[PDB]
């Protein structure tokens, strides 16, 4: 349509909010796959940024393919290689969630302002497989990667 098509020429990026992501308790409810940007390029944002971002972008696409197979076939009948990429993907999509300072009043949890360097090294370590021993819920609603480890540590003490 002329209206959006004309507008799309001027856009440098997009941010698609989804109910599907919101229904999984993931706020902000930004769709990681559908949201895109022009400046996502090795030459513009560096080589490190592009590689880590594409790693998260790939593993979430692979997760969605493997998530279907679970519904069609079953829980097992999946190569151990896939079950690792599924487990890491569910940690990644939870680490994408973040508590905001704006929401402090009605939510209660403290907001976080994650720097660019902390964000990249956070997801980079998850793809490499450094925090595989940690659970899924440890990465839910936290700022930097340090709080994800500290949150996992507040279980085990006061476990169960």
């Amino acid at each position: 349509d002329p209206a959006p098509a004309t507008t799309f020429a001027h856009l440098d990026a997009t941010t698609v909010l989804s109910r599907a992501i919101a229904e999984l308790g993931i706020y902000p409810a930004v769709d990681p796959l559908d949201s895109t940007s022009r400046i996502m390029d090795p030459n513009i944002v560096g080589s490190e940024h592009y590689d880590v971002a594409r790693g998260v972008q790939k593993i979430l696409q692979d997760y969605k393919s493997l998530q279907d197979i679970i519904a069609i076939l079953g829980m097992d009948e999946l190569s151990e290689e896939d079950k690792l990429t599924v487990s890491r993907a569910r940690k990644i999509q939870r680490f994408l969630s973040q508590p905001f300072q704006v929401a402090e009043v009605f939510t209660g949890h403290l907001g976080k302002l994650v720097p660019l360097k902390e964000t990249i090294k956070g997801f980079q370590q998850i793809l490499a497989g450094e925090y595989d021993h940690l659970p899924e819920q440890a990465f839910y609603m936290v700022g930097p990667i340090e709080e994800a480890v500290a949150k996992a540590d507040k279980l085990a003490e006061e476990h169960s």
Partner: peptide, 18 residues
């Protein structure tokens, strides 16, 4: 469900360790 159980198992591992 499977990974929900895995969360409890790994949490028991770090329970015994840390």
């Amino acid at each position: 469900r499977y990974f929900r159980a895995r969360a409890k198992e790994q949490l028991a591992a770090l329970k015994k360790h840390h």
